[PDB]
Amino acid sequence: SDSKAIAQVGTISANSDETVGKLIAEAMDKVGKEGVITVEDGTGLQDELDVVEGMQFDRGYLSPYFINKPETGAVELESPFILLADKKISNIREMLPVLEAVAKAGKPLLIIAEDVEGEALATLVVNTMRGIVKVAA
Amino acid sequence: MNIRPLHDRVIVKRKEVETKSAGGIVLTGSAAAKSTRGEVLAVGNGRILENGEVKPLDVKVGDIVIFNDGYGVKSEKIDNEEVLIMSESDILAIVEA
Amino acid sequence: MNIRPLHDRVIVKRKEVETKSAGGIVLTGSAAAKSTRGEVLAVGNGRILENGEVKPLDVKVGDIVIFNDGYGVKSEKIDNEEVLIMSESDILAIVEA
Amino acid sequence: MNIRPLHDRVIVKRKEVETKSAGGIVLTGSAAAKSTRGEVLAVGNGRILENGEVKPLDVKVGDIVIFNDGYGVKSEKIDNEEVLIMSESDILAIVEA
């Protein structure tokens, strides 16, 4: 149960490599008991441990224009309103109520669904631009 | 040079296509649509149907009106500006107040 | 700014699409259908056919009615609201009592 | 609430589709067909064509009639019942005797 012992088995398993058990022990000590752990090939020659905090997934933004502060496509919608759907939004752009409802509150907005066409994005770009509604999906 | 409609025929000019204001604050981008409103510029005498008399048109020059952009409507370049030509028939209503 | 039809043309507003209550207690979900009832808002002068005179419309501003949403029916946004425009033609009946 | 037709427009209700009694004793199942008979419920004022006057309808409220269930025929739910709407045009004859 202690991190020590755990480091010992990892180590022993990895043909006596302390670095391993050490690392592993750490990971477990972090992600927890039901925390997930996976191994991939590293860039450098040193072993490296990355730990995701909170909620996150493998999806990038469709509206590259909607980058908040930092680069690399970094968006940082401060105090947003998350939105979830079950379909794409080509010209189904109809929904401005919901939209304008926040343009009202003046809070950033995050979106999720089957997808989103430029029709929505386009307008979305200049809205968030003009300072109408800081958003992206 | 300016024009002169041919009775029944009315010369108008559309307006702003999908003006960014819908939804209130929402700056509605042009999602591949057009405008139906326009202004009265020229008025044909009046329809000449049924021989007996030639009925005047219910639209005074300059009126703000809503129309059905259909086939009967055409386009021309007057003084290098877009203009529309349909019959009073095509004109649906009028914007007031 | 409000509207003004153009004789014969009647301005209306549809109602609640498949309102949940049919079948009695049954909360009927919107099975991809639309509404046919509406409320008269504006009334054009009256038909002008057959030259002689211009016959009025049998519908007073406000009537609750049922129409055939055919081709002739169009849509617009006045003050940011959905409105329909057809000729008295399309109107079939008026809900009363 | 009940309905009020709009001149020329007649309100009726169909009847028993492929009622089992054909061939005499034979109980004819519904081989995928419909009914053409119905009862008059509401009568519109009367056609208004050709300006001059507004001709009444040759169909009193309640008649038993046969009609061509075509396009001009529509459907509606009144008090939660099926009802059809066509012009006297669509009506062909009246079951008497």
Output phi, psi for A84, to 5 deg: -115, 135
- For B46, nearest residue in chain C (alpha carbons): C51
Compute the half-sphere exposure of residue D35: CA atoms within 13 Å on the CB side of its CA: 15
CB nearest B26 (choices: A100, A119, A122): A100
Buried b (16+ CB within 10 A) or exposed e, A128-137: beeebbbbbb
C81 touches D at CB < 8 Å: no
- Which residue is associated with the tokens 């004793």? D25
Contacts of D51 in chain C (CB under 8 A): 49-50, 52-53, 55
Residue D37 burial (CB < 10 Å; 0-12/13-18/19+)?
middle
Beta bridge partners of C86: C10
Q: Under DSSP, is residue D10 helix (H, G, I), strand (E, B) or coil? A: strand
Output phi, psi for D34, to 5 deg: -130, -175
Q: In whole angstroms, give the CA distance from residue C68 to residue D86.
A: 11
Q: Please state, in angstroms and as integers, the Cα–Cα distance from residue C92 to each residue in A131, C62, D45, D69, D74, following that order.
A: 49, 15, 12, 16, 10
Non-local (6+) Cβ contacts of A119 within 8 A are: A89, A90, A91, A93, B29, B31, B32
Output the DSSP codes for chain C. Answer: --EE--SSEEEEEE--TT-TTTTTT------S----EEEEEEE-SB---SSSS--B-S--TT-EEEE---TT-EEEESSS-EEEEEEGGGEEEEE--
DSSP at B97? -
| CA neighbor of D66 nearest in space, from D91, D31, D32 | D91
Across the interface, whether the CB atoms of D6 and C58 are under 8 A apart is answered yes
Give the experimental resolution in Å.
Answer: 3.0
Whether the CB-CB separation of C2 and B97 falls below 8 Å is answered with: yes
Q: In whole angstroms, give the CA distance from residue B46 to residue B48.
A: 6
Does chain B reach chain A with at least 3 CB pairs under 8 Å?
Answer: yes
Q: In whole angstroms, give the CA distance from residue A17 to residue A7.
A: 10
Kindly list the domain boundaries of chain D, sorted by start residue: 1-97
At what angle are helices A3-13 and A18-31 packed, to 10 degrees? 140
Whether the CB-CB separation of B21 and A96 falls below 8 Å is answered with: no
A126 touches B at CB < 8 Å: yes
User: What technique determined this structure?
Assistant: X-ray
Q: In whole angstroms, give the CA distance from residue D26 to residue D23.
A: 5
Residue A15 burial (CB < 10 Å; 0-12/13-18/19+)?
exposed
Whether the CB-CB separation of B27 and A127 falls below 8 Å is answered with: yes
Whether the CB-CB separation of A99 and A136 falls below 8 Å is answered with: no
Distance from CA of C40 to the nearest CA of D (A): 14
A127 touches B at CB < 8 Å: yes
Question: What's CA D77's distance to the chain center, in Å?
Answer: 15
DSSP at B91? E
B1-97 sits in which CATH class? mainly beta
